[PDB]
Amino acid sequence: AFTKEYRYSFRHNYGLEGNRINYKPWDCHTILSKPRPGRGDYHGCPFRDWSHERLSAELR
Amino acid sequence: TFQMFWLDYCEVNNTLILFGKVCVSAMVQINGLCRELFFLPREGKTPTDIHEEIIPLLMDKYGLDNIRAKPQKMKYSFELPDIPSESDYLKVLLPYRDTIPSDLSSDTFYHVFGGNSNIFESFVIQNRIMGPCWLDIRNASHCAVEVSVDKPQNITPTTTKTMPNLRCLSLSIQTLMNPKENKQEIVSITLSAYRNISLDSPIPENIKPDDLCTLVRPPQPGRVRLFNNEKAMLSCFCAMLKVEDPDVIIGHRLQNVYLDVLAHRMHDLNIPTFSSIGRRLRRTWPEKFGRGNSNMNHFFISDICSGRLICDIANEMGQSLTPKCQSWDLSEMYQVTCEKEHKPLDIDYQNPQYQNDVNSMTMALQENITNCMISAEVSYRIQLLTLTKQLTNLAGNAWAQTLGGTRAGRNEYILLHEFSRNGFIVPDKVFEPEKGLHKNYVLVMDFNSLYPSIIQEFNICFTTVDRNKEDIDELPSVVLPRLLANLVDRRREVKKVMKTETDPHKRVQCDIRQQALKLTANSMYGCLGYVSRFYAKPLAMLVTNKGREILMNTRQLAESMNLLVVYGDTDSVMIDTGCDNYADAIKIGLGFKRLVNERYRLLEIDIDNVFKKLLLHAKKKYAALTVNLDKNGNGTTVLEVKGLDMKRRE
DNA sequence: GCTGCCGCCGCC
RNA sequence: AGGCGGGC
């Protein structure tokens, strides 16, 4: 998808590195708690982060 | 005639100095040494054609009345293209700052070997000196005897296998950190003298020192001397050192910690007698000493110590003999090697208690003394001196180098001596891991001797492998192997003698001998494989591919035994035995060893490490429970960690 | 000393 | 993205 810095972090998410914690996937509460997305960010929750205009077009 | 058992050397003013024993210390300055240069004649030329041309030209530049030169037939089989397998060369003996470039192209010759020859290397090769041995041979040194010789030919090696007694001095240094300048200052020094250490006989356990003395300055058993400052202490230290005149300085983390500090403090405090740390006398430090070059400074210190062997039990060499250690902390090494307990005291002289509390100061000084005595006993128990000496004699390099822990050291000399003796011109200078917890016993199998066996089986050599010297990336097709064979055979003879040998002393000695032979043979690959004076990419590749085939079949064999390879590489292969019993696991391991040898009769693998449990995380990152057997068969578990976050500084 | 920036090293 | 350490 990305057509030194990243390999380790992805293995670390699987509990394969360092303290070997098998990190739990985030629930909505956790996702919503992260800093709000700005321009160029895609994390967060579209129901909170998108305008009603954008949500309506997606739902249509 | 003059008889000296040489230990170490140093280069100075285009001369070569040897320090050794005659028993008192002695130095021999060697003059008249020359580089052996070999002029390669062009198509249709002779050594005399060269002789006429360059000799008059050399006499002028260097200003010599006469220069010894003679024709000599030499072979060449290394990586330089266009140079023939064998030719008549002109051997020019050019006495030892302007060097003759190798590309000296003339109408007589086109190439020259031995232009940048090192003086110590020249002496040792020409006189066929193979490590520390007996040699039949004003105010320059700290030695009892100072002599010189007009020509190197005056020195010839002897066959004597025995050696003189050594004077060892164990050093333990306690320091203090000044936060102002970030400088580790010396608070105390312990000196324990063992004036008669014989490597020809086993060293008695818990050997008692001939003299014990501690020097100490204010931070804020044996003799104890108190000083008003650090400068007076270090001056006294240097004087005592000169008088003691040890052949070996034993310690723990001297090489890269305490020895550097000591030198730098002697520098800082302008100690005039600093040079007694070695056996050569110097009035001044090197010009570029203390230029903030932690890399170059190390060289200067090693050089200044020349004449006295640095026996560091916790350096790269020392660690290799104590693989059952994990931190290599002094207390840990003492426990592992001697099976005796010592609780390390954390001495911090910045603490105010040490200024007025006589009992605190006394406890700290007692800690330092104990540590010194421990360092010595460990060094003798692990037999660091004997093994490194053997390795030096096998490779024919300098003992100092071996005690240091170099890779291009015993691997370059061993080859220069073999090839030079046989009339050759020498060059100028994997299985993805099964990540997870493994409940069944896992055995680490060591394939160190993979490559040597490969080089010996397929007869891989610089002299045998036709290769494209223009294109080193070209894979070619199937002296060095004969040398390997000799080492293997000798090792066999030692083991055969071991089965019969009854004397615990002679037995242990045999064990050291075979260890030395094994290490020497298992270090031969680096010669041609590491990117090395004898580097040859086509040869490295050729050996590697055969190593891949062998390993692939090996994987198949393990699987054939219903075993699973948890991890593997060119050095080792870890196999899950599928057992929960030490005995059952060992039987599996032996069956695997035997199986592999039947397929590869010159490849002898063995069980190196037994893991009761193994949590594998990456290639070289795991935690495990190693099983260490005791004398009475008794088995004990111990934690071992490599590469985990827990190994980062903290 | 602190502050701030840039690079590297893992962790969380 | 955050924290810690080292260097300039």
- Count of residues making up chain B: 650
Does strand C come within 7 Å of the CB of A18? yes
* Burial tier of B418 (Cβ tally within 10 Å: 0-12, 13-18, 19+): middle
Residue nearest to nucleotide C11 (CA to C1'): A18
Map B437-463 to HEC letters.
EECCCEEEEECCCHHHHHHHHCCCCCC
Q: Which of A16, A18, A19 sits opposite B435 (nearest CB)?
A: A16
Neighbours of B393 (CB within 10 A): 19
Which one of B437, B616, B617, B620 makes the best mutation probe of the A interface by having the most chain A beta carbons within 10 Å?
A: B617
Q: Are B280 and B29 in contact (CB under 8 A)?
A: no
Residue nearest to nucleotide D6 (CA to C1'): B649
Judging contacts by C-beta atoms under 8 Å, the chain A residues touching residue B645 are: 18-19
Contacts 24+ apart (CB under 8 A), A11-18: A16/B435, A16/B617, A16/B618, A17/B617, A17/B618, A18/B645
Neighbours of B494 (CB within 10 A): 19
Task: Name the nearest CA neighbour of B391 among B414, B420, B363, B372.
Answer: B414
B435, closest residue in chain A (CA to CA): A16
Does strand C come within 7 Å of the CB of B650? no
Distance between terminal CA atoms of chain B? 59
Q: Are B604 and B597 in contact (CB under 8 A)?
A: yes
Rounded to whole angstroms, how far apart are CA atoms B548 and B553? Answer: 9
DSSP line for B587-621: HHHHHHHHHHHHHSTT---EEEEEEEEEEEEETTE
Angle, vertex CA B118, rays to CA B112 and CA B123, nearest 5: 105
Report how far apart, in Å, the C-alpha atoms of B72 and of each of A7, B33, B39, B99 are.
59, 19, 10, 22
Neighbours of B52 (CB within 10 A): 10
Judged by a CB distance cut-off of 8 A, whether residue A16 touches chain B is yes
- Shortest alpha-carbon distance between residue B644 and chain A (Å): 7
Q: Are B310 and B255 in contact (CB under 8 A)?
A: yes
DSSP line for A3-28: ---SHHHHHHHTT-STT---PPPP-H
Tell me the HSE value of B508 on the side-chain side, using a 13 A CA sphere: 13
Strand order in the sheet with B34-41: B69-75, B86-95, B34-41, B109-113
Rounded to whole angstroms, how far apart are CA atoms B438 and B444? Answer: 13
Judged by a CB distance cut-off of 8 A, whether residue A17 touches chain B is yes
What resolution in angstroms, rounded to 1 decimal? 4.6
Rounded to whole angstroms, how far apart are CA atoms B40 and B71? Answer: 11
Dihedrals phi, psi of B286, to nearest 5 degrees = -60, 145
Judging contacts by C-beta atoms under 8 Å, the chain B residues touching residue A19 are: 645
- Say how many CB pairs under 8 Å bridge A and B: 8
Tell me the HSE value of B585 on the side-chain side, using a 13 A CA sphere: 23
Judging contacts by C-beta atoms under 8 Å, the chain B residues touching residue A16 are: 435, 617-618
DSSP state of B199: T
Nucleotides of C under 7 A from a protein CB: 8-12
R_g (Cα) of chain A, nearest Å? 16
Dihedrals phi, psi of B394, to nearest 5 degrees = -70, -40
Q: Are B94 and B119 in contact (CB under 8 A)?
A: no
Question: Token pair 């030395």 is at which residue?
Answer: B516
Inter-chain touch B617–A17, beta carbons under 8 Å: yes
Rounded to whole angstroms, how far apart are CA atoms B346 and B330? Answer: 12
Token pair recorded at residue B641: 């960690």
What lies within 8 Å, CB to CB, of B374 at 6+ separation is B252, B330, B331, B333, B334, B342
Token pair recorded at residue B638: 């111990």
Rounded to whole angstroms, how far apart are CA atoms B387 and B512? Answer: 6
Task: Name the nearest CA neighbour of B620 among B577, B578, B572.
Answer: B572
Collapsing DSSP to helix, strand or coil, B44 comes out as coil
Task: Determine how β-strand B309-312 pairs with β-strand B248-251.
Answer: parallel
* Burial tier of B216 (Cβ tally within 10 Å: 0-12, 13-18, 19+): buried
Task: Determine how β-strand B34-41 pairs with β-strand B109-113.
Answer: antiparallel
Which one of B641, B645, B650 makes the best mutation probe of the A interface by having the most chain A beta carbons within 10 Å?
A: B645
What lies within 8 Å, CB to CB, of B28 at 6+ separation is B2, B4, B6, B17, B18, B20, B137, B147, B148, B149, B155
Dihedrals phi, psi of B353, to nearest 5 degrees = -60, -30
Tell me the HSE value of B329 on the side-chain side, using a 13 A CA sphere: 9
Inter-chain touch B645–A20, beta carbons under 8 Å: no
Distance between terminal CA atoms of chain A? 29
Rounded to whole angstroms, how far apart are CA atoms B171 and B191? Answer: 5
Token pair recorded at residue B63: 């200003």
Rounded to whole angstroms, how far apart are CA atoms B193 and B373? Answer: 10
Task: Name the nearest CA neighbour of B119 among B218, B35, B208, B219.
Answer: B35
Neighbours of B550 (CB within 10 A): 20
Does strand C come within 7 Å of the CB of A5? yes
DSSP state of B424: B
Interface residues on B facing A, Cβ-Cβ cutoff 8 A: 435, 617-618, 645
Task: Determine how β-strand B34-41 pairs with β-strand B25-30.
Answer: unpaired
Does strand C come within 7 Å of the CB of A12? yes
Report how far apart, in Å, the C-alpha atoms of B108 and of each of B49, B58, B85, B424, B430 are.
6, 15, 18, 21, 51
Rounded to whole angstroms, how far apart are CA atoms B504 and B67? Answer: 56
Task: Determine how β-strand B86-95 pairs with β-strand B442-446.
Answer: unpaired
Dihedrals phi, psi of B415, to nearest 5 degrees = -85, -35
* Burial tier of B39 (Cβ tally within 10 Å: 0-12, 13-18, 19+): buried
Task: Name the nearest CA neighbour of B186 among B235, B143, B149, B223.
Answer: B235
Task: Determine how β-strand B564-568 pairs with β-strand B3-12.
Answer: unpaired
Task: Determine how β-strand B211-216 pairs with β-strand B436-438.
Answer: unpaired
Map B283-346 to HEC letters.
CCCCCCCCCCCHHHHHHHHHHHHCCCEEEECCCHHHHHCCCCCCCCCHHHHHHHHHCCCCCCCC
Tell me the HSE value of B207 on the side-chain side, using a 13 A CA sphere: 23
Q: Are B250 and B403 in contact (CB under 8 A)?
A: no
- Shortest alpha-carbon distance between residue B435 and chain A (Å): 8
- Shortest alpha-carbon distance between residue A11 and chain B (Å): 11
Question: Token pair 């003492």 is at which residue?
Answer: B334
Neighbours of B353 (CB within 10 A): 14
Token pair recorded at residue B517: 């032979």
Neighbours of B408 (CB within 10 A): 16
Token pair recorded at residue A51: 């305008």
Q: Are B112 and B38 in contact (CB under 8 A)?
A: yes
How far in angstroms lies nucleotide D4's C1' from the CA of residue B575? 38
Contacts 24+ apart (CB under 8 A), B239-242: B239/B273, B239/B276, B240/B191, B240/B213, B240/B215, B241/B169, B241/B191, B241/B276, B241/B277, B242/B142, B242/B273, B242/B276
Rounded to whole angstroms, how far apart are CA atoms B454 and B554? Answer: 14
